[PDB]
Design an enzyme around this catalytic site. Sequence first.
Site, short mmCIF file in Angstrom:
data_model
loop_
_atom_site.label_atom_id
_atom_site.label_comp_id
_atom_site.label_asym_id
_atom_site.label_seq_id
_atom_site.Cartn_x
_atom_site.Cartn_y
_atom_site.Cartn_z
N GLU A 25 108.93 41.84 26.72
CA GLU A 25 108.43 42.40 27.97
C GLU A 25 107.25 43.33 27.71
O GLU A 25 106.31 43.40 28.50
CB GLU A 25 109.55 43.13 28.70
CG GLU A 25 110.81 42.30 28.89
CD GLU A 25 111.84 42.97 29.78
OE1 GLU A 25 111.57 43.16 30.98
OE2 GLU A 25 112.92 43.33 29.26
N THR A 44 95.26 50.66 0.06
CA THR A 44 96.39 49.74 0.21
C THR A 44 96.74 49.51 1.67
O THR A 44 97.08 48.38 2.05
CB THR A 44 97.61 50.29 -0.54
OG1 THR A 44 97.26 50.51 -1.92
CG2 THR A 44 98.77 49.32 -0.47
N1 LIG Z 1 99.34 61.33 10.28
C1 LIG Z 1 99.50 61.20 8.96
N2 LIG Z 1 98.50 60.64 8.20
C2 LIG Z 1 98.65 60.51 6.87
C3 LIG Z 1 99.81 60.94 6.25
N3 LIG Z 1 99.70 60.69 4.93
C4 LIG Z 1 98.50 60.12 4.70
N4 LIG Z 1 97.83 60.01 5.89
C5 LIG Z 1 96.49 59.43 6.09
O1 LIG Z 1 96.19 58.57 5.00
C6 LIG Z 1 94.84 58.71 4.64
C7 LIG Z 1 94.63 58.42 3.16
O2 LIG Z 1 95.17 57.17 2.78
P1 LIG Z 1 96.59 57.11 2.03
O3 LIG Z 1 97.49 58.20 2.55
O4 LIG Z 1 96.40 57.25 0.54
O5 LIG Z 1 97.20 55.66 2.37
P2 LIG Z 1 97.05 54.38 1.40
O6 LIG Z 1 96.91 53.11 2.19
O7 LIG Z 1 98.28 54.30 0.52
O8 LIG Z 1 95.78 54.62 0.44
P3 LIG Z 1 95.92 54.53 -1.16
O9 LIG Z 1 96.73 55.70 -1.66
O10 LIG Z 1 94.55 54.56 -1.79
O11 LIG Z 1 96.60 53.25 -1.54
C8 LIG Z 1 94.47 60.14 5.00
O12 LIG Z 1 93.16 60.21 5.49
C9 LIG Z 1 95.44 60.53 6.09
O13 LIG Z 1 94.77 60.56 7.32
C10 LIG Z 1 100.83 61.50 7.01
O14 LIG Z 1 101.87 61.89 6.47
N5 LIG Z 1 100.67 61.63 8.37
N1 LIG Z 2 118.07 46.27 43.90
C1 LIG Z 2 118.17 46.15 42.56
N2 LIG Z 2 117.10 45.69 41.87
C2 LIG Z 2 117.15 45.55 40.52
C3 LIG Z 2 118.39 45.90 39.83
N3 LIG Z 2 118.18 45.67 38.52
C4 LIG Z 2 116.91 45.21 38.39
N4 LIG Z 2 116.30 45.14 39.59
C5 LIG Z 2 114.92 44.68 39.85
O1 LIG Z 2 114.60 43.50 39.12
C6 LIG Z 2 113.19 43.47 38.89
C7 LIG Z 2 112.91 42.87 37.52
O2 LIG Z 2 114.13 42.45 36.91
P1 LIG Z 2 114.09 41.91 35.40
O3 LIG Z 2 114.43 43.03 34.44
O4 LIG Z 2 112.71 41.36 35.10
O5 LIG Z 2 115.24 40.79 35.38
P2 LIG Z 2 114.96 39.29 34.85
O6 LIG Z 2 114.74 38.39 36.04
O7 LIG Z 2 116.16 38.80 34.08
O8 LIG Z 2 113.76 39.25 33.95
C8 LIG Z 2 112.71 44.91 38.99
O9 LIG Z 2 111.74 45.03 40.03
C9 LIG Z 2 113.92 45.72 39.39
O10 LIG Z 2 113.59 46.60 40.47
C10 LIG Z 2 119.52 46.40 40.65
O11 LIG Z 2 120.61 46.73 40.13
N5 LIG Z 2 119.33 46.49 41.97
MG LIG Z 3 98.55 53.82 -1.42
#
Ligand SMILES: Nc1nc2c(ncn2[C@@H]2O[C@H](COP(=O)(O)OP(=O)(O)OP(=O)(O)O)[C@@H](O)[C@H]2O)c(=O)[nH]1
Ligand SMILES: Nc1nc2c(ncn2[C@@H]2O[C@H](COP(=O)(O)OP(=O)(O)O)[C@@H](O)[C@H]2O)c(=O)[nH]1
Ligand SMILES: [Mg+2]
Lengths: 99, 427, 427, 55, 430, 430
Positions: free
Chosen positions: E245, E136
């Site tokens: 972003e 699935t």
């Molecule tokens: N990291 C992580 N992996 C999980 C977990 N549970 C299942 N898996 C992964 O899921 C794989 C098996 O597929 P499913 O868990 O049954 O997922 P599914 O898409 O529902 O597959 P179906 O049951 O056949 O429908 C395993 O090989 C696990 O690696 C979990 O809780 N944590």
């Molecule tokens: N000097 C100064 N620089 C700032 C401050 N806030 C953001 N910047 C600078 O602004 C740059 C990017 O700003 P951004 O988050 O992209 O603002 P946007 O123009 O609205 O997208 C970064 O390099 C920051 O270092 C501030 O309070 N002081």
């Molecule tokens: Mg399933």
Amino acid sequence: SHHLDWSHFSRVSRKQLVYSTEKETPQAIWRVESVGRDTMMEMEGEPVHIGEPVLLKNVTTNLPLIVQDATFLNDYGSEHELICGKLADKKGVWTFTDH
Amino acid sequence: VREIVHIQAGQCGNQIGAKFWEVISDEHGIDPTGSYHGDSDLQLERINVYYNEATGGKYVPRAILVDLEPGTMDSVRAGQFGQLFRPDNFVFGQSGAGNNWAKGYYTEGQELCESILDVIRKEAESCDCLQGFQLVHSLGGGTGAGLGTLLLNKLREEYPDRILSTYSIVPSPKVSDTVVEPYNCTLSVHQLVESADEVFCIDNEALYDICFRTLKLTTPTYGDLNHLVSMVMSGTTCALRFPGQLNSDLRKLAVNLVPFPRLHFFIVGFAPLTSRGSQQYRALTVPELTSQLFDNKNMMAACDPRRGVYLTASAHFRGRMSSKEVDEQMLNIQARNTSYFVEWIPSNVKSAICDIPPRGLKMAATFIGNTTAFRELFTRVDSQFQKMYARRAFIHWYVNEGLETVEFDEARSNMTDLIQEYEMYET
Amino acid sequence: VREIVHIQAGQCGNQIGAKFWEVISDEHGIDPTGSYHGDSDLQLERINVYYNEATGGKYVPRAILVDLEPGTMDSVRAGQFGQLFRPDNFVFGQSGAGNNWAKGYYTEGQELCESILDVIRKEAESCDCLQGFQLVHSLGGGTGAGLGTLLLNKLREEYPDRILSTYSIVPSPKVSDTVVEPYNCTLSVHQLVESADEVFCIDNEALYDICFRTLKLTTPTYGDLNHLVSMVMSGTTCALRFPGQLNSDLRKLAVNLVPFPRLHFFIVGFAPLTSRGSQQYRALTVPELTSQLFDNKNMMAACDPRRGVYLTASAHFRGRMSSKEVDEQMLNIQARNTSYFVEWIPSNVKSAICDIPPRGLKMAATFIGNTTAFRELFTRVDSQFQKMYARRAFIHWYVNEGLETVEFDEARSNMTDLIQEYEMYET
Amino acid sequence: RLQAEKEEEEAYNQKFLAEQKLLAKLAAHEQAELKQIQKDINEFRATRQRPEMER
Amino acid sequence: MREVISIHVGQAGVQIGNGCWELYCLEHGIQPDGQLPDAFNTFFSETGAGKHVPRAVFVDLEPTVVDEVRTGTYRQLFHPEQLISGKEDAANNYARGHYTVGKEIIDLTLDRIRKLADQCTGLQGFLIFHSFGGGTGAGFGSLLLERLSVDYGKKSKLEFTVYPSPQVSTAIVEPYNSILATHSMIDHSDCAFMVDNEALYDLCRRALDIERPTYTNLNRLIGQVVSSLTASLRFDGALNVDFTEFQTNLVPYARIHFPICSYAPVISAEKAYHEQLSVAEITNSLFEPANMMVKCDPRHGKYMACTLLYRGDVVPKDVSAAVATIKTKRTIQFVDWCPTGFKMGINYQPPTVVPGGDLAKVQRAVCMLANTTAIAEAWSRLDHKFDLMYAKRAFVHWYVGEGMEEAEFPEAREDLALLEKDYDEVAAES
Amino acid sequence: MREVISIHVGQAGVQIGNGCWELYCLEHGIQPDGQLPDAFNTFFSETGAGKHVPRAVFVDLEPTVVDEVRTGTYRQLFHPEQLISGKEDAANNYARGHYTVGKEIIDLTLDRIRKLADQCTGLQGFLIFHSFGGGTGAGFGSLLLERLSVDYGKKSKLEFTVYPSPQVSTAIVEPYNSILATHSMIDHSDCAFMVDNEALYDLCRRALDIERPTYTNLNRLIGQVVSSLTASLRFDGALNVDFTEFQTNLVPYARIHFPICSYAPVISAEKAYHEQLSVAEITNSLFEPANMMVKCDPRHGKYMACTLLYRGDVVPKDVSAAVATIKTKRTIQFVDWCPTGFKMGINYQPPTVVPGGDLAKVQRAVCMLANTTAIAEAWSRLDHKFDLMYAKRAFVHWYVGEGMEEAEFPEAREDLALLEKDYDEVAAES
Ligand SMILES: Nc1nc2c(ncn2[C@@H]2O[C@H](COP(=O)(O)OP(=O)(O)OP(=O)(O)O)[C@@H](O)[C@H]2O)c(=O)[nH]1
Ligand SMILES: Nc1nc2c(ncn2[C@@H]2O[C@H](COP(=O)(O)OP(=O)(O)O)[C@@H](O)[C@H]2O)c(=O)[nH]1
Ligand SMILES: [Mg+2]
Ligand SMILES: Nc1nc2c(ncn2[C@@H]2O[C@H](COP(=O)(O)OP(=O)(O)OP(=O)(O)O)[C@@H](O)[C@H]2O)c(=O)[nH]1
Ligand SMILES: Nc1nc2c(ncn2[C@@H]2O[C@H](COP(=O)(O)OP(=O)(O)O)[C@@H](O)[C@H]2O)c(=O)[nH]1
Ligand SMILES: [Mg+2]
């Protein structure tokens, strides 16, 4: 308080300064406020109770007063630094006590 | 009554603007909610330049904040200063920025453009006089580079006479925040050359270098980095807002420093800057200020002037000071290093003095200069642009928006001829 | 002593009319029981314009309510101010409306036409003088559009000199509340062009746009929408009821604004509409009203004036105000935007000043304009009509009532000629 | 004259801001009312229209 | 405001759903019932009162995995129509889950995603989870992405999939489904992430200290990476990164989009107290091959673009110094036609811990997503394995009987070869 | 005031009827005895100062259905004359219900309906219910309308009939009765609404959460539509719609009248707790093929003018935005010569819940009547079923023996054929 240029910073955290003075200054004014992000509308003019939690905001900078968990060897002992900054957790909440 | 309208574009512009409005609001003694809690009458003489008055004793800035995604704007609202601005001046889109110059310019910029322009019409035609506009943006991004230049063309079409001063941040050469920057920087510069009267270029690397060298800050955040930028922006307009011995506003600055219409990219630097602990021991005077200003290390843009030559330079002084002492330094600094000024223009250093200094400082000075050392900045980006453009695949992000590859050739050629023009006035 | 007789037709007329008397009674100071409990002598000066006095201090409005089914009439009387009206002015049928124009005009209209005229006769001939009638109706329906126009013909024949001012609601372009509107509106214009003196066009979508844009009403209801229209009907006749520095009644409005007999369709707008939060930023000045009235968003009809050219314009100002300030705004707004005004008519803006403002507001204004942009709204209904006409659509319902197919062809031809007539005078 | 008119203008503005603030208070009250009505409806569904009570 | 919609397919997708949504609910603070004891609206909708509902759809073709959610603790939070379950599973057959059983249920899911999209004022993308080896996950997932491509067009369809392990395998037919699914993904997917189980086992035992893991522990590692990825959309930061972003900066070419993922620091709650873990230290840990979540060595190839996301008390100055230093080394090769190579995102919210979890209360962390030519190593292994089995026609009868025409087998093989050519052509230098 | 008369024919009509009047007495606040523990005049009459009586006549040719009402709790509400029962039913034979047995009772009923029309001073129309497959529903229903057409003439006679289902069928002779009654229906009726049991079965199992429904639940859902349809005449609303408005707005031509029905939200009690159900939500749910009360997909055909009726908390601003959005939906088609295409109505009084009803209580709901060319799909199926039986003439002998001439079979067969291309010509555009 003052507005954090390079010549006014707290001496440990380098955040916004809170200081003591004798001068009549606009910065000396403190306004009080209630806890919560919208609570001020409901209780704008109610009287504050003793032990009630409130915030202390500096008018010219509108920010609350916060104790920061850092110490310096004020030769009276070891006293925590105070800043006026962004509100977080509950360290900025103050309660008046009469005893 | 020389009103100035302020526009902030993108993430970079809003954070610069937000810090900028704190600086002036303190200077005039204005509460963040908008009420005057000030200390002197001289602050109310000419406050009209930047603030409108709402009946009730509230002062509203002449600001328009522009963005393509609402994320940046809500940071301003939730911030300390979220009530001061007029609600209608927040104009934002409902699409991603894209971090793309072409998409911002043509796809989303058009829709926001008409909505933006009418807001400016409200602000522009609200005052008895209007000297110019003011835009803050970055060139590496997508909104500020793309939509910022689009607005700059329309403003020129409607208000040809007015001074369109812009403050721009140029992509850094060593380590930079965006991969597609050489495409964004190249296309934006073509628009800026023909549109804006004045452009100030600022690089983030110098601000890291200046704070780490001089101010001795171990961990400089963007709050302090923008603070250096805001000092330059306030210093330039200080002549409008306060009296002084010798006034010099923007149009005097443009007339003197710009010898030809295309050579108008400027570098900036500010003095005094002194370590937070070393300031007690420093005997700050007029001769001391000039040493910091013309020192290559205080330049806010990473272009060492010693590799080029100066064409014109301007200095602004603030505070109660001697006019004789100011004038002597302009002679000595011009005469002592004659290898760094053009011979066919005598008296390359302009000067001005203003009465009222910023808070905490008894005296301060600001430097604006135009030089052929700018060839360094554009050589780096053109080489990186050429290096990437050799594999046109990244252009596919820009082609799918409508930009044709010829526009890359047009933008690069116009930038190239500007570099050659700087080279040949060096002789 | 310039009495006016008020006539309401259909569902739209009664509900707009019911809110209309709530506005006037509070303005004059009449308790809903009909008695005077005012605060100023000026209110009792010229209440004779709209009211009759029954012996005992009880005032009765000159209102006649017309409908084919009494459903909406009984919804009105349960309202607060329903008791005010004279019970014998309630004229209604006992048959369904049918939302059909031919059914209203021919089948049920003729039966009601006999009695309604005599109710008009009592109110028209009980006064020392009569300036004109006042009609409120909608054009998309079958009762307001059909029976409203039939009474318009009888009124013109009997009382030719008098001014038959009508207020109309035009079907909306995007979502509209009736399938057969193109038939209904096309026929209704044929009667309106030849018989009526003044016609005002209101579009419901523009009312929605104003409420969401300006007043920030999260859920605007038909009470609020009908509230906006009442101010315009209140504003126009304010020159009759209260003193002013420069009087301008209905007949002055028609002579100045109407250059040719068939071009008399008008658009309106009202200022100041203040946002519930933006007020603390808005200082009420005479220029502040002028920006709002001529703003295209404030217009109550969804036809953009910028797409056409103006022929005449009129602004009414209410309150104690400077006569110089009003006259200057007319000259500035005319000279600033000369591209939207006709050359062969200089001084296109008419003005007037009235002394007493609406309650709560110390100044208010009203606008009436005439423009070629009405070519937009006629082409819309003509395009929709032809498509339903090309194949025989719902037509069979109208033909069964007795309406001839040649009446549509006369209706469309006359409507088409008024589209060309606007086009010709644009040059 | 100028003193009298200026004070009258200032008085009018403060009245208007006071009325504006009043409407803002009631507007907040309305949304609080709507939330309570919504919770009342959830109560009716949860306790009185139940699947063990269908005819 | 700004919004994403999550789509989960298969047993791996649903089990990942519990792992991620447990983190989202705990980090935002919403109780499992939908009450509270902000960025809420990016992931959850409000219905009035105080009740929230996730903006996600769970899909599988057998009821066992879904009913564990329906009977589990979190049963009240999810809305019944979102949980969609078929009748009989695909039996590890791509054709079965694409033509016969897939089309039995495809149109029912498309209504629920579109109806969920009506509550989206500012939708900016989707997130889709697969397991390539399953029936699935590949068969129905391919059919789902093909329809969503035309239903919505230019909306970012990000994927986060589990690439087959280099040697560890649970299904013999695994090479068949992975190759067939790849053709459907490449043209329609905006960008697709790969992780593999074999690398996670090694990372969950070496860096994090567990002798023997289960799939539950692996799912929490993925949950942290996804949470960091979307943190820019939800919380304040010095440098936000929107989805758009992310798309432009990473992919250099139309078909080269495939990145790889890494997270740092991953360290046991015991040893985490022992190090300061500066920005420089954690940044250096990402670039080692041992921390990579995909078992392909970057040194065999080159780097095409990189993106770093920081969640903690991380200052812009010290980020630049660390990225500058890693550029100075000559073990991290870059294609010289990409001089810049980085986008940095910074957010303030620190990583959140989970009860019964395996990680620590770390005050700063970094997430890394880069495109490399070293992934061509992984494609070569799968291509060779498919060639051996198809040469003798080892399993063709199962797939052809379930509606698939045999001509698709060489078409999928040819299309993978073109992708391998693209990766080698990109690695060329001028 | 303004009056409406209801007439009920057959088992379907009668046992729908007592369900509807159960709703209406509950809605106004009238006890089963007719007393009280306004808008009564539209449906009831006052005898002296205390007692109300429905304006209804119940007609069937067999006593079993009627006598259930006569012995029930509601027996005191109705006038004994209103309940009219024949001697022996028509045995699902149109000829028997039209010619032989129908004429035995036609004139007795016509006096009783006329006598009730004297009490209705401002009468504006009638409602008549049918089951097409029934002998009395089709046979006597045709005879009733033919007489009623000349009796009253210019009065709006609306019908509410049950179309035989595409596959679900309980009568073998079912196609024969439907076509014969259709020819009489088309000339005399002003407008008649189509519904079928099969679509109501699927909706009331899927949306309403019932495993095993009966005719009782379906009769409730019909009552909701009729109650909302009449809500404009009874209670206040911002946009009222009279009966005569439906006649002109919906039908483009004389013979194309047949609309179809839809209603939303239909939701279980414990799911309406879970979902928001705003104005835009319910409008979107109306246009899905699943909510249609006739099992014909509108996507096969095109839409002409549609009528919307809202009840409850709906505000006119939100209506316009919702319907404007549905125009943007490109899965909905409109014929070109209907650009307006809509008729909207808004009423304040919310729907009335029932003791032990399955429908939840939403404070806002919407009803729809839409006219579409998709109904031509149903006519083709009915025609095909009739054609198979008539070729070998499998049931002619029963009809001819009961007074019917055969020449009526092909003539009514041609009249349906003309209607089939009536719909195809309308479906075209220029
Ligand atoms: N990291 C992580 N992996 C999980 C977990 N549970 C299942 N898996 C992964 O899921 C794989 C098996 O597929 P499913 O868990 O049954 O997922 P599914 O898409 O529902 O597959 P179906 O049951 O056949 O429908 C395993 O090989 C696990 O690696 C979990 O809780 N944590
Ligand atoms: N000097 C100064 N620089 C700032 C401050 N806030 C953001 N910047 C600078 O602004 C740059 C990017 O700003 P951004 O988050 O992209 O603002 P946007 O123009 O609205 O997208 C970064 O390099 C920051 O270092 C501030 O309070 N002081
Ligand atoms: Mg399933
Ligand atoms: N919706 C609904 N349909 C019904 C109900 N009862 C019967 N029907 C339909 O009615 C049709 C059967 O015809 P009858 O109800 O007996 O109508 P009739 O005119 O009395 O038939 P005769 O016995 O000849 O008098 C079948 O198609 C049923 O589907 C009901 O309670 N609800
Ligand atoms: N502004 C406003 N428009 C209304 C109101 N009621 C109805 N309308 C509009 O009036 C138009 C026609 O109304 P209609 O019912 O046909 O009135 P009729 O003339 O009595 O038949 C519709 O398009 C409605 O949108 C109201 O209260 N206010
Ligand atoms: Mg029967």
